Symmetry: D2
Subunit: 317 residues, 4 copies
């Protein structure tokens, strides 16, 4: 049987973030049928409260485990609120074909019809499966195999919370994986980024666009350290004429201006359509939602501050 | 006898070469005369991402004047898609008329291959002219659908199916005919407590985003710049970072309303007292309303009340 | 507390259709917090094997319970395969404002993260809520309140199985009901149909449309006693040139011809668009899928043989 | 001139309608003057039909035309204009039998070109743009409606009336915007150059028919369809390809008498039919159709049964394609 390590970080999957990883494992006795499992407690947090120091710590531990010939696959138990951020971060920085699965639950294990037991079983099943090798980071909730790149928490309350605009890649049913699509975007072994060479993360913040929005949050975020601002625009990353001149001033001051959107079910932000990105030296976030865009920007800016290069990266990952 | 419909033009891609005037929009759809007696007015000519509160009030006031007119049976507003959902919701809250009001845009300009605006505008006029539209609240007629102005949102970029509701389309409009499948459940228009005839200004309300490693910076700055309420676009069920909570408590104590929405917009809602102790902190949840929708309801509600209990009632009824 | 009766019919919700109704109720001890529950076993079937006599027996028993002063609400536990058919049938024939909720589960109770406990709790909650009165028949799976009219089993395996083209009407969360839409179509107390008058249903059958289809299934079904045929056409209820003449002959000879489709995520079939329905005296099924269209056709034909009236009905219900 | 050579094989449909199957291919091309900017476009009228009336003879004819053009050094990509009703069936058929890496795009429209805001102009432009793009090579058969790049394998007509008609349970693979292609997923199932099937070796298709499952269903349709020549039956079941107890005996007798029994469903937005779950497939020597809808399962079975009548081999095929 495969050797799978479970790194626990908290979340509702661990709600009485109360239960330790040994308790979570003990709650799924059937894990022993499909893998040789062992658990570590990396942290014990509510994921809405995650820090960049937590991401790096988790990232570095995943890398140490992926380097061990004693580990075949890795599962991370996590809160659902920022699961999608972690999953994408690991997809960019972990230079391994070994399976990495991120899993949570919408209901604590004490609730009626709690979803974590089966989610956790499926995460270990997928992490133990030869078919998962080289697929990038995966998320295994709602019987699905979702790409960590572009899966997002799209539905509140319901167990079907996690969706991608580009569909699930597969399903996991009675411990068996069934694949229907492969990834197209750069990940894990084919990434130019590596956690082994990342000691610090640049500060990236996010500001919302809406009717009657001002330049206030943009300026204030930059003044308090943002090296890049993700603009969560209306429509195709649209920017109000009131706010354009502030963003131009920010960019000249050296803040990357990355146009994302709050239009998150499909489509993407097209360069030079709604704003003159060439003239302004701005970047579009392609299909990536604001919080995903922030992750890619921050990892990218460990390597380059060149806005052309950042655009390439937003078109490749 | 054909319905008298007024088209209030505001700009948007439907008018792209916000370049074409209302008379040219109407001339572009000669089949309109088969379904209604149409006349056009240019209220403004903007890209909707650049709309101001002043612009939004001008539109609201003018809709009310035309609604009160005996020569008007329905009203169509042509509008940019970017903030169409915000305008539609605003009108839903403040226009105390049973006359149909339809807001419509397009994802492509009329110059484009397979442009969507012609049929969208025809469908808008058809719905505004239909007896079945009376008393249904503000409607949005894109993609052959009849969508509620309350909770339709621009959810898909690029594609003509851009506008979606978590609660589904209420109907369809096909070869000029309306087909209904659901009715509204939330308060609107004639059943609303709000009235644009009493509203000539709007309180400043702003939106701050939640994500990993977020700080209190944006919340503080928006309040320092005049925000009377903050919409929190949280992760998950309106969840708030432990590093933000203290600032939100400070701001609420200074009189700023704290309203928990989310960026989890395909379904579900934010539940009071679940992720945060709303009762203890005297905060409000935005129920199913996305952050921009939440901001429009908060700003309208705060013309009438600063009581967070009443605000919450309003978030549960509209 | 509301007096709720649970009428068990079988399904995976009763699997290990094995468990009796008293064991189902005992499996959710929390029901006693929210209603006074009593259970009856109406039948014990796999819903894929349901018959028209099963529908009548169930319907009649629901009508008897709705006429009782000691009953406030009724929950029917059911297999998921033909849940949508039963739900719709009851929507058409039960002339009561009392809540009627139909519920199943995708997983049996012995399974990891089984969905039946919470679905049954929610069903009782909804059946006990004054907000459910007058709403028609409801389906309460996946934390949703779905209309019995047009909810369908659209997704296999997953707990989100049940979807409507026109959206959920509400949600049920920690026992509380939250409404967002109301029904538009005729149902229950405002239906012209009543189960008290119906002794046996007309035989109606369904034939599929696809490339290189012939008239064989249509003729055989009619030969073996179909009084209407639901055409599950491609597209907008489209009919092959090789099939049209047979359907003209079958209509001439008194068989109703109802054009539905296997295009079931959205839209509707439009009269006179793909076929000359007025000339052929055929009927379109509007938005209704083939199995739902069958239910409506059977009920409708208990009142009328006039295709114009049948079309009215397909446009109102 | 460096522009890609793209041939449009017209077959009919609403894309060729007036307010179906009225306009010839020259009028289609002439209606998109911009095609000249992106490819060297030539046409051929293969047929002129409403696609709900397509035959197996029509499929073979089309397949063989596609094959010859794919073999031509003077053709870079192929576009088929088609009625939307059975577009999904043709697109999957070609994905199974065309042993080429050259782009093949199937396209239709929901509205005729005479209509307000007609969809066909842009759909055809996008089909040509995709058929001309190097990124399309090796991707299998594509469908390019609603600004999407969909897999011909598992895209289906799922929404009536609206221009977003075509959907896949597994998502769009890409989008096409201002003539440019943007990819987000790749195929996982066998297709085209990696298919074991080849139209060059198929002169005949075995007869396959489809019957529906629903309450109070009987064995009548299954028996009549087999009596009138069906070599396989696709069972369009409720739920997880579930079969009524009233029908099971009939399917066992048909199977014993040489008729393949293939369990699909009318549950088409997600999931799949799992072997041995609702019916003892092993014991009965039946096949499950996996995620494939009934009409898609019929195409696969038809093609598969040109090579094998071993139900174990047919199940392998339903799990690989
Ligand atoms: N707030 C929790 C929610 C969850 O896990 O469902 C977390 O993200 O830690
Ligand atoms: N930026 C435009 C987009 C559109 O109308 O589609 C607007 O909102 O005015
Ligand atoms: N075949 C079972 C499946 C289920 O209940 O989920 C039934 O319909 O009875
Ligand atoms: N019945 C037409 C429909 C269309 O093309 O949209 C066809 O399939 O030929």
């Amino acid at each position: 049987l495969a050797n799978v390590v479970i790194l626990a970080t908290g979340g509702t999957i661990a709600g009485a973030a109360k239960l330790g990883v040994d308790k979570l494992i003990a709650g799924v006795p059937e894990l022993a049928d499909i893998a040789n499992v062992r658990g570590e407690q990396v942290m014990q947090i509510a994921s809405e409260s995650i820090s960049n120091d937590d991401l790096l710590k988790l990232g570095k531990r995943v890398a140490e485990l992926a380097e061990s010939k004693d580990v075949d696959g890795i599962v991370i138990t996590h809160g659902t609120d920022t699961l999608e951020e972690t999953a994408f971060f690991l997809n960019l920085v972990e230079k391994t074909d070994k399976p990495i699965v991120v899993v949570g639950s919408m209901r604590p294990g004490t609730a009626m019809s709690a979803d974590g037991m089966l989610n956790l079983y499926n995460a270990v099943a997928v992490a133990s499966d030869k078919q998962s090798r080289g697929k990038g980071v995966l998320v295994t909730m709602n019987d699905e195999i979702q790409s960590g790149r572009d899966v997002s928490k799209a539905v509140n309350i319901k167990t079907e919370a996690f969706k991608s605009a580009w569909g699930p890649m597969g399903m996991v049913v009675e411990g068996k994986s069934y694949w229907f699509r492969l990834p197209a975007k750069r990940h894990t072994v084919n990434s130019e980024f590596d956690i082994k060479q990342i000691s610090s993360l640049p500060q990236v913040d996010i500001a919302y666009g809406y009717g009657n929005v001002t330049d206030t949050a943009y300026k204030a975020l930059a003044q308090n350290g943002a090296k890049a601002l993700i603009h969560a625009g209306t429509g195709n990353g649209s920017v109000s004429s009131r706010v354009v001149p502030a963003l131009q001033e920010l960019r000249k001051n050296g803040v990357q201006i990355i146009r994302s959107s709050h239009v998150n079910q499909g489509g993407f932000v097209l360069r030079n359509a709604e704003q003159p990105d060439d003239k302004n030296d701005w970047v579009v976030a392609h299909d990536l939602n604001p919080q995903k865009a922030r992750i890619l920007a921050m990892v990218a800016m460990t390597k380059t501050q060149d806005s052309k290069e950042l655009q390439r990266i937003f078109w490749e990952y």
